[PDB]
From a paper:
PEAK pseudokinases regulate cell migration, invasion and proliferation by recruiting key signaling proteins to the cytoskeleton. PEAK proteins are a unique group of pseudokinase (PsK) scaffolds that can self-assemble regulatory networks. In addition to the conserved PsK and SHED domains, all PEAK proteins have an N-terminal intrinsically disordered region (IDR) replete with short linear motifs (SLiMs)—conserved sequence motifs that can that form dynamically regulated docking sites to recruit interactors involved in PEAK signaling. Here, we elucidate the molecular details of key PEAK signaling interactions with the adapter proteins CrkII and Grb2 and the scaffold protein 14-3-3.
Residue numbers in the entry:
A (entry chain F): 65 to 73
B (entry chain A): -2 to 233
C (entry chain B): 2 to 234
D (entry chain E): 66 to 72
The structure:
């Protein structure tokens, strides 16, 4: 898997 | 003819551009709203954030794929292929600079000077942190050190406002902790600080989750799950 | 080399999902007045299908919004919505005329094989059909007629150059049947073509290659799916 | 909905 930032719409 | 008519018309266009998935136009619309030097509504700042995120994200994805191809070719040794690859990467990087600077100027000249609530200040300083972080993603040498510093300072400003003005369960606060921890991990390459940030944010929110409403409960728990996901991955 | 570099650029743009640039590269290739390889043909169609598809999706959404607002009665909202649709329709015409021009001025005159001729005439059929999707009045009748002539030409070459199980022939039948139903409003003819294509393929299913089986069977069931849906109506 | 050849 990979790191995650805040998602957007 | 008034500025308020213009504003509603601009916001309606952005909502059309968003439906049609034409984000270049949605950016153009939301940027015009931001130029009036007023406090944006929650809807308007969301539209603006979505518009810029989609525009930059397409390039960020293109850049990652091209860099992948660049690595593979460097291993193989195809210089002529690599000349084309690097020209392509450089073109995408120029688009990235233009986009990042575009919103960063909007933030510095219009949004932040007019922000009057804690939510919106945290929101704008977090964007500033985000877009300086995107610059740092592909910068090198001094330009990279500078982008990293700008990102760090902006995230620290956002955090200083957030810890005194937003509850620890607040989704904007949690989302700020998420992106700031990612910054520690991906840009500063400090996994320890990234984890300690994610864990602290997660723990403070879980303590007061009982006060959370409903619509904010959904958004908060979802961001807490991203914090937990990143933590499990980094600790793996 | 220019050609080899051009094709490598298109493969990068496709990887990056930057389809405007992929179109730019493959268009220079088609202008060379040469028989394209299968690979280059695929690159060309993918580039244009993606550029046009984004607009086709935007147009459908905006058209949907326009209907809802017409029911509601928002006059000012409708003026902006219509202006937006007209802008997207302009983009659509420009993309279509570009590829249609390339097909008529370079690809078809230089086409060297039966499958490639079928391929190019099917593209002509597709992109005139895309014009007809949003045209009105005379422009609509011309686009529909032009689409029909291109599709019939492809079919006539295919019925003599490709086995009925060949994926390009099947994909031609699929898009042509869609045209009959969606543009000409002929469900009868649409189903007759789809079923005909399905039956001719099934009769020679032993002719399918292991490699063509995946593409052909997926296409033939799209024909079956269309058939089921159209008969539902 | 009706569907044509994919890409």
């Amino acid at each position: 898997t990979r790191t995650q930032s805040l998602p957007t719409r | 003819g008034s500025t308020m008519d213009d504003r509603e018309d601009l916001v309606y266009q952005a909502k059309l551009a968003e439906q049609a998935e034409r984000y270049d136009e949605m950016v153009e619309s939301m940027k015009k709203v931001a130029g009036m030097d007023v406090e944006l509504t929650v809807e308007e700042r969301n539209l603006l954030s979505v518009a810029y995120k989609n525009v930059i994200g397409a390039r960020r994805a293109s850049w990652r794929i091209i860099s992948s191809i660049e690595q593979k070719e460097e291993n193989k040794g195809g210089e002529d292929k690599l000349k084309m690859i690097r020209e392509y990467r450089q073109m995408v990087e120029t688009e990235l600079k233009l986009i990042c600077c575009d919103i960063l100027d909007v933030l510095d000249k219009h949004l932040i000077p007019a922000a009057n609530t804690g939510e919106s200040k945290v929101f704008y300083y977090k964007m500033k942190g985000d877009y300086h972080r995107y610059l740092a993603e592909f910068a090198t040498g001094n330009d990279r050190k500078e982008a990293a510093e700008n990102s760090l300072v902006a995230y620290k400003a956002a955090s200083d406002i957030a810890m005194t003005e937003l509850p620890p369960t607040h989704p904007i606060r949690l989302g700020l902790a998420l992106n700031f921890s990612v910054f520690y991990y991906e840009i500063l390459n400090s996994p320890d600080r990234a984890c300690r940030l994610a864990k602290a944010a997660f723990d403070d929110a879980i303590a007061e989750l009982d006060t959370l409403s409903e619509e904010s409960y959904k958004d908060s728990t979802l961001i807490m799950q991203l914090l937990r996901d990143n933590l499990t991955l980094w600790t793996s």
